[PDB]
Amino acid sequence: AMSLENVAFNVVNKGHFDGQQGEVPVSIINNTVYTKVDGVDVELFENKTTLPVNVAFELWAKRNIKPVPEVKILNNLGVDIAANTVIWDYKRDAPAHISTIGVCSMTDIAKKPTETICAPLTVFFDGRVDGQVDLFRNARNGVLITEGSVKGLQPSVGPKQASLNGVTLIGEAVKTQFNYYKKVDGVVQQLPETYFTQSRNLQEFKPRSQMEIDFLELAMDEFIERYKLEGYAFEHIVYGDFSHSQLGGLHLLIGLAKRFKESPFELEDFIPMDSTVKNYFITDAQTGSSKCVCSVIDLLLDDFVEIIKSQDLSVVSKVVKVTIDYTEISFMLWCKDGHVETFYPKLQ
Amino acid sequence: AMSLENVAFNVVNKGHFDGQQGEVPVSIINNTVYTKVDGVDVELFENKTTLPVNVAFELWAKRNIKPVPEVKILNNLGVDIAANTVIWDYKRDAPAHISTIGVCSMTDIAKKPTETICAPLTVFFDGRVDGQVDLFRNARNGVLITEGSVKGLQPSVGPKQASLNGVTLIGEAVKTQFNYYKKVDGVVQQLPETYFTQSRNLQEFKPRSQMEIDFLELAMDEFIERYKLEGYAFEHIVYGDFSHSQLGGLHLLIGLAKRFKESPFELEDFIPMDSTVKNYFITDAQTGSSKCVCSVIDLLLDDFVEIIKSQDLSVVSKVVKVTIDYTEISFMLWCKDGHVETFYPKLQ
Amino acid sequence: AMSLENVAFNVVNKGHFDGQQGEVPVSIINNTVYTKVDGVDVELFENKTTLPVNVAFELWAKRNIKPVPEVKILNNLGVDIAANTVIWDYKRDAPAHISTIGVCSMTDIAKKPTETICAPLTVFFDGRVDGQVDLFRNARNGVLITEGSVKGLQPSVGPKQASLNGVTLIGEAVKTQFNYYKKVDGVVQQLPETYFTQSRNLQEFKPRSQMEIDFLELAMDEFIERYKLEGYAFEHIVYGDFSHSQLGGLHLLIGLAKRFKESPFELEDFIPMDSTVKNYFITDAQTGSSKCVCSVIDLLLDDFVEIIKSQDLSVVSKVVKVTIDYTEISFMLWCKDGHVETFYPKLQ
Amino acid sequence: AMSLENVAFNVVNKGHFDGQQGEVPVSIINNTVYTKVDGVDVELFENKTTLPVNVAFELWAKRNIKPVPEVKILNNLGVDIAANTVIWDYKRDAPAHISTIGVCSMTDIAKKPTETICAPLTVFFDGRVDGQVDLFRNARNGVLITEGSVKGLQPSVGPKQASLNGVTLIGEAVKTQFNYYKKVDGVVQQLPETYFTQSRNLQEFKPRSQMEIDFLELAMDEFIERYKLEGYAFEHIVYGDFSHSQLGGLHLLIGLAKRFKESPFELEDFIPMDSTVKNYFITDAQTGSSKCVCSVIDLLLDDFVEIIKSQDLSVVSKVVKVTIDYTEISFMLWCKDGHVETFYPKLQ
Amino acid sequence: AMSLENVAFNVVNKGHFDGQQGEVPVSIINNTVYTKVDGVDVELFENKTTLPVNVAFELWAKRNIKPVPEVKILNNLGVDIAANTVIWDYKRDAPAHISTIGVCSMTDIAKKPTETICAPLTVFFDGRVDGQVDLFRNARNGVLITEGSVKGLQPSVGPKQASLNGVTLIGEAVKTQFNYYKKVDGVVQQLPETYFTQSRNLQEFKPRSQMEIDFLELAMDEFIERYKLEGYAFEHIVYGDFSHSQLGGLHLLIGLAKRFKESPFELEDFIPMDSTVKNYFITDAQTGSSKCVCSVIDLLLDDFVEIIKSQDLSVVSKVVKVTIDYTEISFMLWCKDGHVETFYPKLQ
Ligand SMILES: CC(C)Sc1ccccc1NC(N)=O
Ligand SMILES: CC(C)Sc1ccccc1NC(N)=O
């Protein structure tokens, strides 16, 4: 007996949808859900989605409150829908997927992922929920996460971090590192060997290795000397070149974080969605150096050093394909006389 | 267990709120309520009120579907709220009253009209509903309607017509003529002697007397001769004067109806609400004669003839107060040499 | 090179989308599309759909402007989507189907109905469009309409009428009677023997048989005598009983049309969508007789007489299933002592 | 002569409504009020209320710009409306009360609080405004604040802090500590002995005692040793337990502030309104420990220590009622073998 | 071939409008532009302007991405429109000017500034764009910026800083100091000798002189002693007086910045637009000292000291006119016995 008033009751009393019985009076005005408290209207939800306000309110109330894979991972793995849950995209303030399975009558395409409509779609399955490993086994298409071993299924160790209520974290009180599994056309697909993005913020950037501590602490030339990085264009790629009107390089998050300590800058997120490679319209405030499309990736500096040092530097220009977050990221490698000139996540 | 989904279920299955159990999926987009049927969205309600869309939808679903007094009568009698019903104002496409009693949790000021918040308000009571005549006995302020006699109470015979789902009609299969009772501060009132407006439409105007049949059939001068109306300015007041840029007179609905048969005209209802006297910005299409504020009353021609023939015609200008629909309507009477020049419902 | 400006250009110059090149300046304000003409904004489209304004504008511009099956037929035949066209639902002011095939980039699930996403869906195909009869041969699920014969396929003669730009008509200058074909899981179906609804309006109702001319012209008792209809409750079912507070019967459109000539009434279309059986909240203006859910079907009086005369009248109450517009309509038949009491399209 | 243009003139010239004469041109588009400056539209107000945009704009312009009691205090004291002022709720971006008295024609229920409509409502009176102490004396229901002694009226010393234009502060240049008085049904009610919440922010939390300085500075075990708090479950209640998936305790703001210095966390304010006890959906970012409904109170640590040390610890579970901000806050006290297990503001 | 889909394509691929060919699918819902990515809608633009959503989206995409004069300078110079560009007002999130020239078909008044409609308007010309110096020479009214000498044209050295994508900065990698030129009625107007505002933020305020370093570092009395400022009311004007209910002075940004280090305060920007003098409704959080209209100017402390020391202090009150950002700012100078009492940017 699902209702707007019951969803609102659950939100008010339980902080989210928790299957409790009860109703609270609700006002819907424009794209906002209100509830009367002390005689006045109090905002419960503001619809930032393209779904109707009451539908979006229900999916947001029914969001997964356990640590879940970051939306960029689900996207990279081709996830279309989730089995009996809502993966909430906190970066977009909207559901990560168009439709639902057993969640809300307005968005539901099926009540159970066993229905034939779900066969062609890659359904997300959560091994932490009873019966979902078996539903993945029977699903034609799907992505499954588990906390442990599934008999006969070859696992892929996922990233250390997961999203818990919009907070990307490496769990200490909860497990955030999952085993990943994927099926395409009934066949269990082998997940490729991959690097993982670190999912760090520029404002609260923390180094996660001795090389990362040395990059942030040391001067440019003594870090490049210490790590034998001469001829790898780190001055351009990682540190950034702010001497000309067009900002040079600056494709690693750690480089933006080092710069951020000294001087601020504006990063325009013109396609605001979680992705392995992010594109920003950057304006350096100290110099006025800017670039409309500056691709940024948050790789551990050690991982980036390993990628660039594993490349053949004998050709003027070429595409270098690197598996990151299960997706193939194309990089553009430009060389001259055996040295790197630039290396950046290719603007497709 | 009131809900948006249950209200929508009732509307879809029962044509209105009927206390049935069940839920249908609903979409709220801007000011419109939709329901999914055959995979697509079907409009259930468009909010034309100042209330939130879901609140207005519920009060409209919970509207009184029995013949009820016309909103102009309830307003004239000082009705503030209704006991356990919604009087729907079909002319405003909104509830006739701000608040409710035992109808909707968002608009309710009380569950029963016996609550102290209702004592200062004139509560509308319906004798056709069990217990409401006795609820009117214990009510400090209120208006009661009945079909028959109430022991100890002297009735006031109301108008022949009532509103049934927005259709004003004189009932043949249902009773539409109610007895009216009013209480002010615990005291049963003596409702005044009153005329009633006929509530007719211009498009479907029907005469309700031999004088009204003679007005519509006969030529102007032979009707005025037949009914001894010489010197009462009917040529101006009732027939209308379309010879000058400013339209002269035309204050009785029957006169507009006679004109409407020959030539059309535009009536701009600039304050669209039910009222004893209506104000229109009229433009005669045949002549181009117009008037910004043309007060129109629908009185039975016999009643209007009685009112104008009962006036002293010896003063240039004066206010003539007439009880119509239980309210005091001020008229402006203009005379010259013992004859009427004009007589119109005063524009204040 | 599809664009908002190009769609608007086509609408302004061609009256609809016609694949012409060009752009006109457009304003989008709330749910309305405007274009500048003579320096001022002129309304091109008002979005009455649950789709975004520009998406709905494009599907409405791309609507099928040929006589097409009425949405109720497509719905009854299980049509999910149309192949490379938009069937516009003029009763809902919205697209008849959720998604499109080769029409609009925002709503498209495929460019051609041969794509695997379309195999589980019943795709509507139009033989009048080149290649669509052969696309229906290779389609797993679909409904085909043709004007003439298809080799190897046994036709189902559809209704005489079709919808041309929202006008339901029996074509004289165009063909409106199509042959219908349906395929379910690669298998050509044998469409059932069916009656068709006549799709007439109450305001412009025209008789389509000598019995229908006699019903509208003759008095109740002499029509019932002429056609030997005594004991079939036509007085109740077809003519209507307006003597009690609850309106009795009145389930055939011809009966509402006969009543409409004498007195008007209000029909509240509370679920406004095309369907074989329509449900109205009716209020008779002459008597005040009313009914919340009055099911109305527009059957040819001869067809209705044949259905009721082909029933066993020996049981108090039972469900009578009749194929109308290819769907199974349940009727409720109430009898007493071998005569009909009522017979109405069952309210479920 | 109140007007939209006059309100806008006052806002533009005086920073708020100041009774000045004049008009500025205004644009209303959707829920925003604009004014033309340098040829372009400049935003004056964005309506975040459920009132119409122009009505909300006027009440916001007419807001009380003097230090006023925090909305949680007014709510706890049962305040329904204010006498000739608008108490603006800066946390909700809306008026603290539904209706007004002598402020705005659209929201006014009366021009003066002496009108009979105000008798049943608890009217807020401000002794700093001439004649309001006398209006409280004559009011059937009311809450009065004063800066000093009122002859014969027994005062209640309120909190040290008040809200000045949305800034909660302890006044140095203005008085923020008021004497409070309350009347119910004509009778001056004795205000209970109460604790007060400190109204601090987590980001700018400042200790207000030597115990509070010692809690923030000292290690958990040496603070518990210094203040003889062994067996009072401060490790759970105040410090918080982040070792399990469900976050343990953490019900005092000072505890959240101590944690905030080391690691960040997300506090979801699912009912965003000022209240003595706040409920948050917390997610600790360092550990991933979370709780859907974590009740938090900002009590001075000395006051909380006094409350918990004044309880009988001989029963497994019981409700402990404590007057805080004039309201009775129920706490749940759980004990085992004479020691505290948990003590939290009860989730009603 | 301008289109919504092409603008969106440019934004998605190039970070702004860059004249590239291509189309991306777009959704318009309410005042937001979305694009489908990974099956879901991603927000491209939220309309905060009074223009239609698609029109505002196009002007924002077509915004000038080079360092441009701050909107306050353009306003002070009487700029009405820009030649073939959009000056984006990042403080208002809207175009700085009502109309465009050669930018967007919906807002364009002309394709080239040579059209007679542009003759009466002051058109902004950018010498960095080919042919714009010549268009200024031929324009009846205009403001021109250049990076160097224009033969025969007497230059005005503008401010050191310019706005680059909403970031006010003094360019190191780009030129931000322009030569300014103005024409009124065909005649090149001499720009006056002017002071410039520093355009600093309170949160990130940096001193730009030894006097400014000494003001922020030194105690009030020793700074006033060091710079011989006794009798110039700096204690009131620059430091601020927070001892009374009405906040005294505080008209220089550096003074607000010094206060901000010790205690926070609320600055209500009631007319949110870039201007030489800003008006704030300030509330000091430490003391509760407040002022509805506190005029604040960001002048270099040396420049302010020079202005106040160049005034005759022998009259009680007078208007002191100072050219700042090319506009004449009126100041109110109040003196007593040869000393300053107050000096503030006059509240007009
Ligand atoms: C008490 C009866 C003899 S009179 C009565 C009957 C029905 C309704 C009302 C009233 N009178 C009243 N004052 O409430
Ligand atoms: C193959 C033909 C003899 S039969 C045919 C002709 C036209 C449309 C459809 C079908 N049959 C089908 N199963 O698709």
Q: Are residues A109 and A196 in the same domain?
A: no
| Contact predicate D69/D178, CB 8 Å | yes
Q: Whose CA is closest to atom 8 on ligand 2?
A: C137
* Residue of A60, A56, A54, A110 whose CA lies nearest to A83: A110
Q: Whose CA is closest to atom 4 on ligand 1?
A: B152
Packing angle of the helix pair E210-217, E253-262 (nearest 10 deg): 30
| Contact predicate A83/A34, CB 8 Å | no
Query: What phi, psi does A239 have (nearest 5°)?
Result: -75, -40
Distances (CA, A) of C310 to B160, C188, C192, C237, C333: 46, 30, 18, 16, 12
State whether residue A240 is helix, strand or coil. Answer: coil
From the list A50, A52, A116, the residue facing C120 with the nearest CB is A116
Query: What phi, psi does C44 have (nearest 5°)?
Result: -100, -35
Q: How far apart are CA C27 and CA C16, in angstroms?
A: 18
A52 touches chain C (CB under 8 A): yes
Q: How far apart are CA B10 and CA C270, in angstroms?
A: 11
E49 is in an annotated binding site: no
Q: Ligand 2 pocket, C136 CB below 6 A?
A: yes
DSSP one-letter code for A154: P
Any residues with CB less than 8 A from the CB of B246 and at least 6 apart, and which? B289, B290, B291
| Contact predicate E233/E339, CB 8 Å | yes
Q: How far apart are CA E87 and CA E143, in angstroms?
A: 13
Is the alpha carbon torsion for A86, A91, A94, A97 positive or negative?
A: negative
Pairing type for strands B142-146 and B123-126 reads parallel
Q: Whose CA is closest to atom 3 on ligand 2?
A: C152
B27·C49 Cβ contact <8 A? no
Type of residue at B118: C
Q: How far apart are CA A177 and CA A147, in angstroms?
A: 7
Which experimental technique did the depositors report for determining this structure?
X-ray
**If 0-12 CB within 10 Å is exposed, 13-18 middle and 19+ buried, where does residue B93 land?**
middle
Q: Are residues D34 and D45 in the same domain?
A: yes
Pairing type for strands C40-46 and C32-37 reads antiparallel
* Residue of D234, D242, D241, D240 whose CA lies nearest to D301: D234
Type of residue at B185: D
List B residues 112-151 in contact with D (Cβ-Cβ < 8 A): 116-117, 120
Q: Whose CA is closest to atom 9 on ligand 2?
A: C137
* B324: β partners: B195, B327
| Contact predicate A284/A242, CB 8 Å | yes
| Contact predicate D197/D299, CB 8 Å | yes
> Which residues of E are catalytic, by number?
236, 251, 291
Question: Looking up tokens 């209320």, which residue turns up?
Answer: D49
For D14, the enclosing helix (H) or strand (E) is helix D4-14
Pairing type for strands B100-101 and B108-110 reads parallel
Q: How far apart are CA D298 and CA D72, in angstroms?
A: 13
CB atoms within 10 A of CB A185: 9
Q: How far apart are CA C30 and CA C265, in angstroms?
A: 35
Point out the domain boundary residue: B135, B161, B191.
B191
State whether residue E221 is helix, strand or coil. Answer: helix
Q: Ligand 2 pocket, C137 CB below 6 A?
A: yes
Question: Looking up tokens 């405004």, which residue turns up?
Answer: D129
Name the minimum distance, in Å, from the CA of D96 to any CA of chain A: 7
Active site residue D244: no
D34·E50 Cβ contact <8 A? yes
| Contact predicate A132/A125, CB 8 Å | yes
For E224, the enclosing helix (H) or strand (E) is helix E220-226
Both structure tokens of B248: 């002269």
Question: Looking up tokens 């859900």, which residue turns up?
Answer: A33
Q: List chains touching A (3+ CB pairs under 8 A).
A: B, C, D, E
* D33: β partners: D28, D45
* Residue of D43, D37, D64 whose CA lies nearest to E269: D43
Q: How far apart are CA B249 and CA B251, in angstroms?
A: 6
Q: How far apart are CA E303 and CA E186, in angstroms?
A: 34
Both structure tokens of A137: 């086994």
Name the minimum distance, in Å, from the CA of A97 to any CA of chain E: 7
Question: Looking up tokens 């402020």, which residue turns up?
Answer: D103
> Which residues of C are catalytic, by number?
236, 251, 291
Q: Concatenate the DSSP letters of all residues of C34-46 into one string.
A: EEEETTEEEEEEE
Any residues with CB less than 8 A from the CB of D306 and at least 6 apart, and which? none
| Contact predicate B300/B51, CB 8 Å | no
Any residues with CB less than 8 A from the CB of A201 and at least 6 apart, and which? none
Atom of ligand 2 nearest to the CA of C151: 6
Q: How far apart are CA A305 and CA C312, in angstroms?
A: 88
A28 touches chain B (CB under 8 A): yes
For D59, the enclosing helix (H) or strand (E) is helix D53-61
Q: How far apart are CA B163 and CA B71, in angstroms?
A: 9
Type of residue at E346: K
Point out the domain boundary residue: E156, E173, E191.
E191
Taking CA atoms, what residue in C is nearest to E21? C1
CA atoms within 13 A on the CB side of B302: 10
Q: Whose CA is closest to atom 7 on ligand 2?
A: C137
What size, in residues, is chain A? 348
**List of long-range contacts for D330-339, beta carbons under 8 Å, 24+ apart:** D331/D307, D338/D231, D338/D313, D338/D314, D339/D231, D339/D232, D339/D233, D339/D313
Q: Are residues D2 and D128 in the same domain?
A: no
Any residues with CB less than 8 A from the CB of A182 and at least 6 apart, and which? A77, A78, A122, A142, A143, A144, A156, A188, A189, A191
Q: How far apart are CA D65 and CA D10, in angstroms?
A: 14
| Contact predicate A45/A57, CB 8 Å | yes
Q: Are residues A101 and A53 in the same domain?
A: no
DSSP one-letter code for A107: T
State whether residue D181 is helix, strand or coil. Answer: strand
Distance, CA of C142 to chain centre: 19
Of residues D291, D318, D321, D339, which has the active-site annotation? D291
C292·B204 Cβ contact <8 A? no
Q: If phi over 0 gives left and psi between -120 and 50 gives alpha, with beta otherwise, what is residue B78?
A: left
Give distance in angstroms: CA of C326 to centre of ligand 2. Answer: 21
Active site residue A244: no
Distances (CA, A) of C325 to A341, C97, C148, C180, C199: 72, 19, 20, 11, 11
Q: Are residues C196 and C267 in the same domain?
A: yes
From the list C30, C98, C288, the residue facing B172 with the nearest CB is C288
Output the ligand 1 site: residues, CB below 6 A: B 133, 136-137, 150-153, 183, 188
Point out the domain boundary residue: A149, A174, A191.
A191
Q: Which domain holds residue C274?
A: 192-348
Distance, CA of B40 to chain centre: 38
Any residues with CB less than 8 A from the CB of C217 and at least 6 apart, and which? none
DSSP H helical segments within chain C, as ranges?
4-14, 53-61, 71-76, 132-137, 210-217, 220-226, 234-237, 253-262, 301-309
Q: Are residues A60 and A73 in the same domain?
A: no
Both structure tokens of E119: 């003759």
For A14, the enclosing helix (H) or strand (E) is helix A4-14
For D283, the enclosing helix (H) or strand (E) is strand D277-284
Q: In degrees, to the nearest 5, what angle opens at C-alpha E108 toward C-alphas E103 and E110?
A: 100
| Contact predicate D117/D110, CB 8 Å | yes
Euclidean distance between the first and the last CA atom of chain E, given in angstroms as a whole number? 48
CA atoms within 13 A on the CB side of C266: 19
Torsion of CA C292, C298, C302, C305, to 10 degrees: -20
Q: Are residues E121 and E187 in the same domain?
A: yes
Atom of ligand 2 nearest to the CA of C150: 7
Q: In degrees, to the nearest 5, what angle opens at C-alpha C163 toward C-alphas C159 and C169?
A: 70
Q: How far apart are CA C36 and CA D13, in angstroms?
A: 37
Give distance in angstroms: CA of C135 to centre of ligand 2. Answer: 10
Both structure tokens of C122: 């019943």
Both structure tokens of B172: 């043949």
Q: Ligand 2 pocket, C140 CB below 6 A?
A: no
State whether residue E68 is helix, strand or coil. Answer: strand
D30 touches chain B (CB under 8 A): no
For E142, the enclosing helix (H) or strand (E) is strand E142-146
Of residues B62, B97, B251, B278, which has the active-site annotation? B251
Q: Whose CA is closest to atom 9 on ligand 1?
A: B137
A15·D80 Cβ contact <8 A? no
State whether residue C208 is helix, strand or coil. Answer: coil
Atom of ligand 2 nearest to the CA of C139: 14
Packing angle of the helix pair B4-14, A4-14 (nearest 10 deg): 170
| Contact predicate A259/A216, CB 8 Å | no
Euclidean distance between the first and the last CA atom of chain D, given in angstroms as a whole number? 48
Q: Are residues C78 and C164 in the same domain?
A: yes
- For chain B, give the secondary structure using H, E and C: CCCHHHHHHHHHHHCCCCCCCCCCCEEEECCEEEEEECCEEEEEEECCCCCCHHHHHHHHHCECCCCECCHHHHHHCCCCEEECCECEECCCCEECCCCEECCCCCCEEECCCCCHHHCCCCEEEECCCCCHHHHHHCCCCEEEEECCCCCCCCCEECCCCEEECCEEECCCCCCCCCEEEEEECCEECCCCCCECCCCCCCCCCCCCCHHHHHHHHCCHHHHHHHCCCCCCCHHHHCCCECCCCECECCCEHHHHHHHHHHCCEEEECCCCCCCCEEEEEEEECCCCCEEEEEEEECCCHHHHHHHHHCCCCCCCEEEEEEEECCEEEEEEEEEECCEEEEEEECCC
Q: How far apart are CA E255 and CA E240, in angstroms?
A: 7
State whether residue D122 is helix, strand or coil. Answer: coil
Q: Are residues A310 and A219 in the same domain?
A: yes
C117·A120 Cβ contact <8 A? yes
Both structure tokens of E42: 């991603």
Q: How far apart are CA B55 and CA E192, in angstroms?
A: 62
Type of residue at D246: Q
From the list A98, A271, A293, the residue facing E40 with the nearest CB is A98
Q: Are residues B309 and B171 in the same domain?
A: no
DSSP one-letter code for A90: T
Q: Are residues A79 and A60 in the same domain?
A: no
Which residue of A287, A296, A327 is the best one to mutate when testing the E interface, meaning the one whose CB has the most E CBs within 10 A?
A287
E35 contacts in chain C (CB < 8 Å): none
Is the alpha carbon torsion for E231, E236, E240, E245 positive or negative?
A: positive
| Contact predicate B81/B124, CB 8 Å | yes
Active site residue B291: yes
Q: How far apart are CA A192 and CA A189, in angstroms?
A: 9
Q: What's the count of helices (H) and strands (E) in chain A, helices before strands?
A: 9, 21
CA atoms within 13 A on the CB side of D61: 31
Q: If phi over 0 gives left and psi between -120 and 50 gives alpha, with beta otherwise, what is residue C202?
A: alpha
Distances (CA, A) of C32 to C27, C49, C57, D247, D312: 8, 11, 9, 50, 68
Taking CA atoms, what residue in E is nearest to D33? E50
Domain count along chain E:
3
Q: How far apart are CA B155 and CA B191, in angstroms?
A: 9
DSSP one-letter code for A329: E
Q: How far apart are CA C123 and CA A83, in angstroms?
A: 28
* Residue of E118, E69, E66 whose CA lies nearest to E326: E69
A203 touches chain C (CB under 8 A): no
Both structure tokens of B340: 């009427």
Stated resolution in angstroms: 2.0
State whether residue C78 is helix, strand or coil. Answer: coil
Per 3-state DSSP, chain E is made up of helix, strand and coil in percentages (nearest 5) of 20, 30, 50
Distances (CA, A) of D144 to D83, D150, D183, D192, E148: 10, 10, 9, 15, 69
* Residue of D345, D309, D302, D296 whose CA lies nearest to D231: D309
Distances (CA, A) of A338 to A250, A302, A312, A314: 22, 22, 9, 5
Q: Are residues C145 and C185 in the same domain?
A: yes
Q: How far apart are CA C163 and CA B86, in angstroms?
A: 40
CB atoms within 10 A of CB A339: 11
What size, in residues, is chain E? 348
* A184: β partners: A187
* Residue of D252, D230, D250, D253 whose CA lies nearest to D240: D250
